[PDB]
Amino acid sequence: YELTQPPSVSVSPGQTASITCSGDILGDKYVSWYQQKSGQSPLLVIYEDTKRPSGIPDRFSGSKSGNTATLTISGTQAMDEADYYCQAWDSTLGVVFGGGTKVTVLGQPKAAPSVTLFPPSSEELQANKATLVCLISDFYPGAVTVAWKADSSPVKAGVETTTPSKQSNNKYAASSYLSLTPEQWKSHKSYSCQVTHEGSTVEKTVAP
Amino acid sequence: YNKRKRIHIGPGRAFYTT
Amino acid sequence: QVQLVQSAAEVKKPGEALKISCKGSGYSFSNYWIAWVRQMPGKGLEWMGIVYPDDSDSSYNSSFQGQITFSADKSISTAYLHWTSLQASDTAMYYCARLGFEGDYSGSFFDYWGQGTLLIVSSASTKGPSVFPLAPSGGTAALGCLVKDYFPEPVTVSWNSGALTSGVHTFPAVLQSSGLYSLSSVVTVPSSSLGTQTYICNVNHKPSNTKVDKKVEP
Ligand SMILES: *[C@@H]1O[C@H](CO[C@@H]2O[C@@H](C)[C@@H](O)[C@@H](O)[C@@H]2O)[C@@H](O[C@@H]2O[C@H](CO)[C@@H](O)[C@H](O)[C@H]2NC(C)=O)[C@H](O)[C@H]1NC(C)=O
Ligand SMILES: [Ca+2]
């Protein structure tokens, strides 16, 4: 049970970031907003729809119109890059958060990922195991989704994907792994890792 | 009674049930 | 100033019991509700429940009722989240947070949060990795090492004993549903060096005293 926020907002320094949060309970319930910087705890930045705690800059403002609350950051600064969550209370089900919005304050052009897909090594197949390794680098902003195919069919079992991590060039990296038996491996024409970033996809394929 | 036990979650008589 | 300080990172096995703590200072700890919030890596905030430390009154998200309970030791201003039998899916970050006041009542927002406690639940015992080569298959070729099935973190990787640093990219690990980590490191090299230059990944896993230098052949 989550309130609905856009997954991502990207703005250049100085521009306004507008983050919405909607849900059927919000019309008569107070909305809070938290900022969570990478690797840090959430921090309250708006409560009771429009109020700012002490120590929060006036460039953060909240508003609400019916079932939709909006956090507006005016004059966005680099230090405002964070994930932002809205919150409210269902009367019987308790604290409901939004899904979060990753706000990136752009310091370089958007960059699609570079994808390198390794098949299982001959050493691993000799150890009766098979792991396909999809290494994803140099994307910005730092969020991707990964889908895998066996031939042309979606495969979900056996997939494990990392969170993104920031690189020394301020772009991001992530990896996804698909575990197969050697027999699953050898029995398809090919497997593919498809990485989606900002609506566009980069695909690599390997074959036994 | 301890009024801090009540959790007020919207304007008016809008509380969470504990 | 209000502070909430949580207990240190935990690494446990499925079926074990655990309690983690949140100690509040700078205010009257008994008088404010404490929430517990779960965040799986890379995912959002999920509410678990709330406890009132003056009387241990609790209200739970009923999806977690029966796996968790709360308590509080008022003599040392500390609240607790308990599990009596962990499962692997309990791996996550857990925050406590203070619910603020409004008027005469408690309010609707969490005005202070702890720094988090990271919980990892895995059946694994200390285990060093198997290191497999990721063979180059230009003018550039990527080659690398797959550092598979080790526990716990961390691992370090270098190339040619630290002599090769440019074009090295060492990825953070994945914790697999098996309870073991894997990671990979890749170096991009001139296609033309493949016949002549030796490429060795130096992997160290100090918890298991595993130190391996793996040659990656074309
Ligand atoms: C209350 O908790 C439920 C259950 O959460 C899931 O189960 C837990 C035991 C733990 O594994 C969580 O990480 C899981 O997400 C939450 O309901 C889930 O909400 C997410 C987000 O909308 C949705 O994807 C899941 O399908 C939901 N699962 C269920 C069984 O309903 C819920 O949002 C929590 N908060 C409230 C206010 O109920
Ligand atoms: Ca700056």
A12-31 residues touching B, CB cutoff 8 A = 28-30
Residue A134, burial from CB neighbour count under 10 angstroms (0-12, 13-18, 19+)? buried
Question: Is the beta carbon of C64 within 6 A of some atom in ligand 1?
Answer: yes
Task: Say how far residue A81 (Cα) sits from the centre of its chain.
Answer: 13
Beta carbon of C59 within 6 Å of any ligand 1 atom: no
Residues with CB under 5 A from ligand 2 (ion): A 78
Q: Taking CB atoms and an 8 Å cutoff, what residues of chain C touch A161?
A: 174
User: What kind of fold does domain C124-218 have according to CATH?
Assistant: Immunoglobulin-like (2.60.40)
Kind of pairing, strands C200-205 and C156-159? Answer: antiparallel
Q: Are C174 and A177 in contact (CB under 8 A)?
A: yes
CATH number of A108-208: 2.60.40.10
Say whether C197 sits in a helix, a strand or coil: coil
| Separation CA A190–CA A57 (nearest Å) | 53
Task: Specify the resolution in Å.
Answer: 1.6
| Ligand 1: residue whose CA is nearest its atom 27 | A1
User: Partners of C131 in the beta sheet?
Assistant: C147
Q: What is the DSSP letter of A188?
A: S
Show me where the domains of chain A are located.
1-107, 108-208
B-to-C residue pairs, Cβ atoms closer than 8 angstroms: 34
* A160 vs C contacts (CB less than 8 Å): 174-177
- Output the CA–CA distances (angstroms, integers) from residue B1 to B16, C103, C140, in the order listed: 17, 15, 74
Interface touch B7/C103, C-beta < 8 Å: no
Kindly identify which residue of chain A lies nearest to residue C185, measuring between CA atoms: A135
Quick check: helix, strand or coil at residue A59? coil
A25: Cβ contacts below 8 Å, ≥ 6 apart: A67, A88, A89, A90, A91, A96
CA of A84 to the centre of ligand 2 (A): 19
Please tell me the distance from the alpha carbon of residue C117 to that of residue C128, in angstroms, as a whole number. Answer: 25
Q: Is A58 left (phi over 0), alpha (psi -120 to 50) or beta?
A: alpha
As a whole number of angstroms, the distance between CA C55 and CA C51 comes to: 9
Around Cβ C191, how many Cβ atoms within 10 Å? 12
Q: What helix, strand, coil percent values describe chain C, rounded to 5?
A: 10, 55, 35
Residues of chain A contacting residue C173, judged by C-beta atoms under 8 Å apart: 162
Ligand nearest to the CA of A75: 2
List every span in chain C annotated with CATH 2.60.40.10: 1-123, 124-218
Task: Please give the full DSSP string across A106-118, using - where no structure is assigned.
Answer: -SS--BPPEEEEE
Contact C46 A100 (CB under 8 A): no
For residue A152, what are its two tokens?
């042309």
Inspect the interface and report whether the beta carbons of A167 and C44 lie closer than 8 Å.
no
CB C44 within 8 A of CB A100: yes
Contacts of C54 in chain B (CB under 8 A): 2
Put residue C4 in one of left, alpha, beta given phi > 0 → left and psi -120 to 50 → alpha: beta
Cβ(A142)–Cβ(A104) below 8 Å: yes
C1-123: CATH topology is: Immunoglobulin-like (2.60.40)
Name the CATH topology of A1-107. Answer: Immunoglobulin-like (2.60.40)
Residue with tokens 């694994």: C124
| Cβ atoms of residues A82 and A43 within 8 Å | no
Give the DSSP letter string of A104-165: EE-SS--BPPEEEEEPPPHHHHHTT-EEEEEEEEEEBSS--EEEEEETTEEE-TTEEEPPPE
Contact C134, A121 (CB under 8 A): yes
**Distances, alpha carbon C85 to alpha carbons A114, C12, C50, C81, C118, in Å:** 42, 10, 20, 13, 17
Structural determination approach: X-ray
Q: How far is the CA of C175 from the centre of ligand 1 (A)?
A: 21
